[PDB]
Amino acid sequence: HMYTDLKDKVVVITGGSTGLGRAMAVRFGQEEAKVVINYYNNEEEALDAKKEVEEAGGQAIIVQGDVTKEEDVVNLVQTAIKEFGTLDVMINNAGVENPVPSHELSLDNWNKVIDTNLTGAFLGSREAIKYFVENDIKGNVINMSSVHEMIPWPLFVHYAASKGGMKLMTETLALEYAPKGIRVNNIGPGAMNTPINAEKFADPVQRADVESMIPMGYIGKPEEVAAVAAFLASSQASYVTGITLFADGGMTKYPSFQAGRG
Amino acid sequence: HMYTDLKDKVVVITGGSTGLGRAMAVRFGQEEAKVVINYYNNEEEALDAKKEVEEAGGQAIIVQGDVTKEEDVVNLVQTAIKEFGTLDVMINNAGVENPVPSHELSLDNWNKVIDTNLTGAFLGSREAIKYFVENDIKGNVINMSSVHEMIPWPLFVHYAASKGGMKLMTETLALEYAPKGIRVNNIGPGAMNTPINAEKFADPVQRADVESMIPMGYIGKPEEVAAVAAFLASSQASYVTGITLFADGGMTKYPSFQAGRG
Amino acid sequence: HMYTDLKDKVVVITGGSTGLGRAMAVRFGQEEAKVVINYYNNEEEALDAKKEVEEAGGQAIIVQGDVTKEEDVVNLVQTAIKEFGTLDVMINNAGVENPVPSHELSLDNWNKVIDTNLTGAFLGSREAIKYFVENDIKGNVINMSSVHEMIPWPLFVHYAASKGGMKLMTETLALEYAPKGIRVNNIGPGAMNTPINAEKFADPVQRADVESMIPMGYIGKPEEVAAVAAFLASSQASYVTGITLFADGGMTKYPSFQAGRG
Amino acid sequence: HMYTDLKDKVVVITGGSTGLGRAMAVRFGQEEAKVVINYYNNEEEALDAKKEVEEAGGQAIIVQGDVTKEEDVVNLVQTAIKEFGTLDVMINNAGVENPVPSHELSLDNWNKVIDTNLTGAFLGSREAIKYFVENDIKGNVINMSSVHEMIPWPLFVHYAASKGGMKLMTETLALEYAPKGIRVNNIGPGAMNTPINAEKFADPVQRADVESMIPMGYIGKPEEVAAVAAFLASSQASYVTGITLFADGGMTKYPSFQAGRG
Ligand SMILES: OC[C@H]1O[C@@H](O)[C@H](O)[C@@H](O)[C@@H]1O
Ligand SMILES: OC[C@H]1O[C@@H](O)[C@H](O)[C@@H](O)[C@@H]1O
Ligand SMILES: OC[C@H]1O[C@@H](O)[C@H](O)[C@@H](O)[C@@H]1O
Ligand SMILES: OC[C@H]1O[C@@H](O)[C@H](O)[C@@H](O)[C@@H]1O
């Protein structure tokens, strides 16, 4: 397989039962890693994810946890260490979103997205780094961001804020822990073919509309994001820290400006 | 009298009793605006500031409120509309910070900084914009960010995240409400001579350290940021929305690279 | 009379006879500065502009010069120091553009745009700064960039490259000369009502297209950019160096994402 | 070997006989690619580079060319096609630099760095894209940038400009040709252990000084950059376009801000 240094590395993935999280679990499974699949409520998908990793060539366990609960995040990293012996790669992937005019967005709804998307990533990143520091491991953090750490998003001001914060969070932790050989990076996916977008992409006018904002002309396959995660996690990215690697088919390049418009 | 168009405009300023908030309070006073001074903690400072605004040629009230409590933020905008008749410029200035190695940062300390710096600014922005939409006003929002929406800040991951989040929040709201003539901008201060820095700068070794990180060579004067706020709030900045205007004596330009090191 | 500190300052403006350069010429005229108007091609326009500056309350000369010729740029600064006694603000405004699919762009067409847009601004900046260093003056440089130092621009790769280059040039010179009190900033215009756009906008379908890409909804007025220049040149912007201040009605905020598409 | 899709891909590398260029030739040689090594004057190093590629498992030819001469760049891509059958990956790596106070930097010296670093990359990128377009190949461009497309660099204003322009050049070409499946990306190396820096890193105070601006605490090995190039060139980066992937050990994260300074 591709990245041989990933063999038997322990990888924790939050929201890892579906979409990008699942595709990442499978890919790390293809690299013969030991994957810890976090999930919120749907146990059966997690169990399904677990079997793919096994079938792909990897070891895997599943662990229930809500990333807005500190104890769950703490339990997740502890369970990983308990079961597999260590922790090598931490992937904070869980996220929620919903459209609301910003002047009508409730505090509770704002908080839910901030707590889940940003705070949960802080908690995950903290617990992993704590462990790498205490055990002198040159570990790796991957935080799942979005093109929306750069692209503003009307109706999604909570989401946009959460990823803008995630960017400075990541860049801070990378600077802080770079002297310990702990690397910290973001991935910035564009429009991806995942369960949350599977509704949106039903309407063929909606699918076309979204595709019109992707310069490469297609909605990303989750495996294309998982490829970026495996690269970033590997010793191939040894000198890469504090970055956001956008995998968006050009979406951050301002799709309205194609053909010399403007 | 510089920006005549600011005369009699209503300007609400969270944390307007000390530091940059006070400096801005005074400045809109010099432009003879109606300044609403929010304070949390210390009425005697707020009273002293209400005075300066009045001497400078302005009108002023003081309103107690915690920016992390929704009712306090809603009450603040409502109070401005009761006392002065309307709202023209919403300035979200309140912020806090404290150094903690990130792997040792507690969730509550993380939450306090996020709640204060980012969520309070969201609440402030939301309440102002709502007032602007429903009443057909081409209002203005200034969000007080930091060089640290761009410069990462070890020991201050919570603060950095809050300002990174404020950037995307500001940019989203600027895009979302631009077609309505509502402008939304950030100011990015560097190291300013304010109460938030008084302990740091009292230590002559630390003042010297901070100064060596400012290309222009001096710690900023709070009135140098207030000049930026007056400009942005004015119709001089009519085509200017969604920006962060750094007032940092060059700090974002990478102080370690002066004289061609690297 | 807004920025009183600008009274009697010497302001050199390349391409100051039309468009934004003219708008800026007039504006420093209103601040009663001494405006030196560089023009390349068309004395009758430059004469018409010299007039407006004089009517507005300013003093003005016109100086013929090609910004791609070093002797012309050196002569221009020298002429300003001969006619007016000194130099206070150097504004590098001259720029050109034309659409060509990039894979069909000729080296000479690439070179013309680079030479004009970036190298001319370097030469202008260099000559002004040299004058500032050797004579202990806390002078000011404004470089006229574009939303396209950030927004990529198919069919205009040469123009985009020139402005991306202008950004790093400006930022380097701001850092390099900050300890001397010399400030160096960019302005980033969006789509402005100028001669460079007259053909584009004459076509009502094209004017409508461009307008749909501006969040604020209108093509910018040249005086809205000149307001930004007056601010930056003033001592109001004393702590502001190394920035790009976009005046673009929100264009850099990603027009394709209005209303939550994506 | 790692990226099997790279087997027998034709890769052109400018300045590919030494430093990062050489390390990239070798790595692509390790992936059993066919490498075309451009070089300026030192034929013997090129010949050495050629043999490593062969010994690493790859096919290779060498070709003399000055990237400031259009005919040489045109000849380079033509020779690649002549000899190997096609072109798949174009890598514009050639670059020069030298320290000069900016107000003393000559036009000729400015031009040399602009012509080499930026214009040469445009020429290389153009010739490759022309070929991919005419032959419906989903080819790949990698432009060698620097941390200095983001980090300003006093005494190196020409270099900083050239890479700032390279960034917008790349991002433009990525947006323009994304609909054809042609990806265009930058790599942003920090301080790397290469012939040009081999002088600087002799002085142990200079080596230490440079290392003090690398958060990860070491000067990059050229192979760590070559790893990024192989990733970007591969179908693993299928959804990655228009990006700059910094490989700088954290240098862009503002090294002066370590330990909560500022
Ligand atoms: O680091 C520069 C400055 O950034 C500001 O946002 C902080 O409030 C200061 O405490 C700090 O000195
Ligand atoms: O400053 C970091 C590094 O940047 C690169 O672009 C330069 O070529 C190196 O010489 C330098 O050490
Ligand atoms: O695309 C927005 C605008 O950018 C400016 O820099 C160009 O000069 C205009 O022609 C263009 O309309
Ligand atoms: O807007 C592009 C994409 O950004 C992602 O962050 C969101 O989760 C997707 O739903 C969206 O389609």
Q: What is the rounded distance in angstroms from the CA atom of residue C71 to the CA atom of residue B148?
A: 43
Q: Residue A189: which of A159, A216, A226, A160 has the closest Cα?
A: A226
Phi and psi for B3 in degrees, rounded to 5? Answer: -95, 95
Q: What is the rounded distance in angstroms from the CA atom of residue C180 to the CA atom of residue C131?
A: 12
Q: Residue C94: which of C54, C65, C131 has the closest Cα?
A: C65
| Cross-strand partners of D10 | D34
Helices assigned H by DSSP within chain D: 19-30, 43-56, 70-84, 107-113, 120-134, 157-177, 195-198, 204-211, 222-233
Q: What is the rounded distance in angstroms from the CA atom of residue D170 to the CA atom of residue C164?
A: 11
The answer to whether the beta carbons of residues C177 and D152 sit under 8 Å apart is no
The answer to whether the beta carbons of residues B96 and B84 sit under 8 Å apart is no
C48-72 burial, b at 16+ Cβ within 10 Å, e below that, comes to ebbebbeebebbbbbbebbbbebeb
The answer to whether the beta carbons of residues B92 and B124 sit under 8 Å apart is yes
Phi and psi for A89 in degrees, rounded to 5? Answer: -135, 130
Q: What dihedral do alpha carbons D17, D19, D23, D29 form, nearest 10°?
A: 0
Q: Whose CA is nearest to atom 1 of ligand 2?
A: B262
Would the CB atoms of A257 and C209 count as touching at under 8 Å? no
Residue C131 a catalytic site member: no
The answer to whether the beta carbons of residues A60 and A17 sit under 8 Å apart is no
Residue A51 Ramachandran class (φ > 0 left, ψ -120 to 50 alpha, else beta):
alpha
Residue B260 Ramachandran class (φ > 0 left, ψ -120 to 50 alpha, else beta):
left
Q: Which atom in ligand 2 lies closest to the alpha carbon of residue D146?
A: 6
CA distance readout (Å), D67 to A199, C24, C117, C175, D87: 51, 40, 22, 30, 18
Resolution stated for this PDB structure, in Å: 2.0
Tokens 């997740």 correspond to A76
Q: Residue A6: which of A37, A30, A38 has the closest Cα?
A: A30
Q: Residues near D239 by Cβ (< 8 Å), separated by ≥ 6?
A: A190, A216, A220, A221, A224, A225, A247, A248, A249
Ligand 2 binding pocket mutation candidate from D93, D145, D146 (most atoms within 8 A of CB): D146
The answer to whether the beta carbons of residues D118 and D139 sit under 8 Å apart is no
Three-state DSSP class for B88? coil
Q: What is the rounded distance in angstroms from the CA atom of residue A30 to the CA atom of residue A54?
A: 9
Q: Which helix (H) or strand (E) holds C188?
A: strand C183-189
Q: Is D190 in the pocket of ligand 2 (CB under 6 A)?
A: yes
Q: Residue D213: which of A16, A202, B258 has the closest Cα?
A: B258
Q: What is the rounded distance in angstroms from the CA atom of residue A56 to the CA atom of residue A32?
A: 8
The answer to whether the beta carbons of residues D67 and D73 sit under 8 Å apart is yes
Strand order, beta sheet including A183-189:
A59-64, A34-39, A10-13, A89-92, A140-144, A183-189, A244-247
Among all bound ligands, the one having the nearest atom to the CA of C188 is 3
Tokens 């600011």 correspond to B6
What's the half-sphere exposure (Cβ side, CA atoms, 13 Å) at C113?
24
Alpha carbon of A246 to ligand 3 centroid (Å) = 26
Q: Residues near D45 by Cβ (< 8 Å), separated by ≥ 6?
A: D17, D18, D22, D39
Q: Classify residue D92 as exposed, middle or buried by CB count within 10 Å of its CB (0-12, 13-18, 19+).
A: buried
Across the interface, of C154, C255, C262, the residue whose CB is closest to A259 is C154
Tokens of B232: 């942005």
β-pairing verdict for D140-144 and D183-189: parallel
Q: Would you give the DSSP letter of residue B81? A: H
The answer to whether the beta carbons of residues D193 and D226 sit under 8 Å apart is no
Q: Is C192 in the pocket of ligand 3 (CB under 6 A)?
A: no
**Experimental approach:** X-ray
CA distance readout (Å), A217 to A191, A250, B73, B127, D107: 11, 9, 44, 39, 43
The answer to whether the beta carbons of residues D75 and D128 sit under 8 Å apart is no
Q: Is residue B164 part of an annotated ligand binding site?
A: no
Q: Which helix (H) or strand (E) holds A50?
A: helix A43-56
Q: What is the rounded distance in angstroms from the CA atom of residue B2 to the CA atom of residue B52?
A: 18
The answer to whether the beta carbons of residues D105 and C176 sit under 8 Å apart is no
Among all bound ligands, the one having the nearest atom to the CA of B213 is 1
Tokens of C262: 């994506």
Helices assigned H by DSSP within C33-177: 43-55, 70-84, 107-114, 120-134, 157-177
Tokens of A195: 């369960």
Tokens of B258: 């002066």
| Domains of chain C with bracketed CATH | 1-262 (3.40.50.720)
Q: B100 to chain D, minimum CA–CA distance in Å?
A: 9
Tokens of A90: 């931490």
Q: What is the rounded distance in angstroms from the CA atom of residue C63 to the CA atom of residue A199?
A: 63
